[PDB]
Design a binder for these strands. Sequence first.
RNA 1: GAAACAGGGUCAGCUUGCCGUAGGUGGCAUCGCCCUCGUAAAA
Length: 70
Amino acid sequence: MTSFYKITAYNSQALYFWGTDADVDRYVDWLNRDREINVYAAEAIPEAEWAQYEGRDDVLSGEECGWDDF
RNA sequence: GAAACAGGGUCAGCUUGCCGUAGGUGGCAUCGCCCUCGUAAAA
């Protein structure tokens, strides 16, 4: 169920993420700690496209440390 | 080392007596005084 997750907000730097759906939801929450507006939203990247964002260093992973940023 | 948004908006509002009062008073001779004078003018 781990997926490459795109994180978007109106006119905001896209943030690509990899992990579980619960993972991405928690990362969305962390991005939305302060954003009363422009709340980052999670989007599931279609499977075929995954290899593309794969490699891109701008992705957080469902590894242990992918959650120490709090 | 081309193309590239800071953006799409968001009541400072809602409302609040400067008031209740508070002698300018009590009061204090304008005085005490002083010659319009001495004077020249019936052409």
